[PDB]
Every structure is written in C-alpha cells, then in structure tokens.
Write a structure and sequence with these properties.
The chain is α+β, with helices and mostly antiparallel strands. The chain has two domains: 2-125, Alpha-Beta Plaits, CATH 3.30.70; 135-307, no CATH class. Helix content is 61%, strand content 9%. The chain contains twelve helices and four strands, in the order E-H-E-E-H-H-E-H-H-H-H-H-H-H-H-H. The chain has helices at 15-28, 57-78, 91-101, 128-139, 141-152, 157-171, 177-192, 198-211, 213-226, 237-258, 266-284, 289-307; strands spanning 2-9, 37-42, 48-55, 116-121. Strands 2-3-1-4 form a four-stranded antiparallel beta sheet. Strand 2 (37-42) and strand 3 form a beta hairpin. Helix 1 packs antiparallel against helix 2 (57-78), helix 1 packs across helix 5 (141-152) and helix 6 packs across helix 10 (237-258). It is globular and about 60 Å long. 32% of the residues are buried. It holds the Pfam family Lant_dehydr_C.
Length: 310
C-alpha cells in the first residue's frame, strides 16, 4: 500500500554478506505479509543499504520493521563494520556525486555505523518509470542472491557481469548480438571519452582482451546459445533465467512507450530500458562503474571476433 524506506549503515565491511546473511533472511521472515521488497547500494552519509518494502503501516509496525531490527540487527552485532578512518576524506567526492545525481540532503556528518533507521514512505506519487523500475528490482532480488552465492563460493563477478550483459543484448534486441554490440561499445566509449588517460585505458583494455581472446569468444557464443535454446536445459542456467525474468519487462515497457508516457519504441526504447536495468542490476551486485564499462568493452571486442568476420 506504500513504499517504506529503511537505512542500514555498514561503512567498511562486506556488504555481500550483509545482503546474504542479514537481509535475505529478514525478507523471508516477512514474505507472506509483504512480498514486494528490494534493496539498493548508496554512499551518502556513509556506505549504507537502502531497503524498500511495499505494505501498510499496520504490517510495517507488526511484521516488517521488527524482522529488520532483529534479523538484520543480529547480523550487524555478529559481523560489525570496523568503520571508516576519516569520513571527511570523502567529502569532495560526495559533493560531486551529489551535484551529479541531485541529492540535496546533508552529506556530513555521517550516520552512526552499524545501525538501522526507519525513514518513512516514498516521495508522494510515483512516476510510471519509478513503478516499472521497482517492479524490476523486486523481481530480480532472487537473481542477486544467486550471484552473490556463486561469488561467495569462489566464482568471478566480472564474468557474471559478462554473461548477463551479453544475454540481455542477444535475446532482447531487434536483431540480436551482431547489431547490439554497437550499443555495448557505445556504452563503454562514453566513459573512455571523458577520461584523460582514455588512450592508455584502451591499450590496457585491449591487451587484456588479446591475452584472453579465446576465453571471451568461447564464453560469448556459449551465452549466446544459452539465450536462444527453446529447450529448457542448456549448459548454463542463470543466463536462461535472467532472460526469462526480463522478457516480461520489455513488454510492459514497450507497451507503455507506444501507448505513450516515457521517452522506434520497441527497437531502441524497450531494449534501451532493460539494458539500463541490467546495468543497475550489476551495480547492485557490487560491480564498479569502471568494471562495468570494461565488461561492455570486452563484450564488444569478443563480438567483433565472432559476428564481425561477416
């Protein structure tokens, strides 16, 4: 009935664990009364988690709030964050990120580390995109846990970023990977373009590609077949689920572009939005912007060597 907001401060300790061992249980403990709920990373007044959950005030006070305070709080007391040495070391960066993303709220002093805070209900009325986005975040919370599990048991996060980006490109674009590798290049290129060492960046990034050319091209075609099987049991499952989860959301978005709120609508519009959702997904899995751009770039290079010998 509303979106209710909590803040979990965890300034210096492994947010992956806090998600898996604190918030995942807590969310389960209210699954019947409030199934619609998700969380985002954020930086303001200390690195923290932002928790979003859709219920009435009655359910918040009854079931949601105390599952957070007790389950999550339990995790905090077991595995506390050691803290940040100087939060004001981060002020000039934060001042920038505020301007860049319009944040307006106070920046210093930092919230107390290792702590929970109720924050109230969202703005007042949501936009259509806000609604479609929240739906996406909630729908993909299982996929977050899947991944951080794989990461926790030794697997590589860059590689998971790869499989996902690639899959969303081949399966949800108007012409598949051979056409949407331009949008991937394009996405990395906008970052290389404003970096004074872009030149050396591109050399490093291309050395990397060359050293591993066989790994990435092999992996590229794997993810490509996985995403087009019509035979539910390929060599890779997470790809096939990721596609599966996202197909609904293009439709609801492509539908409400040619019925007309937001911005070819399907072609570069639905697929514009769900590639941007994959990017938001990956942020949530703890990939930096740097590492995401690098992944877009390696996907593109890999796609040259297979779809480009045309």
């Amino acid at each position: 009935e509303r979106w209710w907001r909590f803040r979990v401060d965890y300034h210096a300790g492994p947010m992956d664990d806090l998600i898996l061992d604190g918030v995942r249980p807590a969310f389960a403990a209210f699954a019947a009364q409030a199934p619609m709920a998700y969380f985002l990373r954020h930086w303001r007044r200390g690195p923290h988690l932002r928790i979003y959950v859709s219920t009435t005030r009655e359910a918040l006070e009854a079931v949601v709030r105390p599952a957070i305070e007790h389950v999550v709080g339990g995790y905090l007391r077991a595995r506390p964050s050691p803290g940040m040495a100087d939060p004001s070391a981060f002020l000039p960066l934060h001042e920038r990120l505020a301007e860049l993303e319009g944040e307006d709220g106070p920046l210093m002093p930092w919230s107390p580390d290792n702590t929970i805070h109720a924050e109230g209900e969202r703005p007042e009325p949501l936009t259509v995109r806000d609604v479609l986005l929240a739906d996406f975040y909630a729908d993909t919370t299982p996929s977050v846990y899947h991944a951080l599990e794989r990461v926790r048991s030794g697997a590589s996060l860059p590689t998971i970023a790869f499989d996902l980006v690639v899959a969303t490109a081949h399966a949800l674009s108007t012409g598949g990977l051979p056409v949407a590798r331009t949008s991937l290049r394009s996405h990395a290129e906008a970052y290389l373009a404003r970096r004074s060492d872009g030149v050396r960046l591109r050399e490093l990034w291309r050395d990397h590609y060359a050293r591993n050319r066989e790994a990435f091209t092999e992996r590229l075609i794997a993810v490509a077949s996985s995403a087009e099987s019509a035979e539910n049991g390929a060599h890779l499952p997470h790809v096939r689920e990721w596609v599966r989860r996202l197909r609904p959301i293009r439709e609801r978005a492509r539908a409400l572009l040619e019925s007309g709120e937001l911005t070819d609508s399907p072609a570069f519009g639905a697929y514009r939005l769900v590639i941007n959702c994959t990017y938001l997904h990956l942020t949530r899995l703890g990939l930096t912007p740097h590492q995401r751009f690098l992944v877009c770039h390696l996907a593109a290079d890999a796609a040259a060597d297979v779809y480009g010998i045309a």
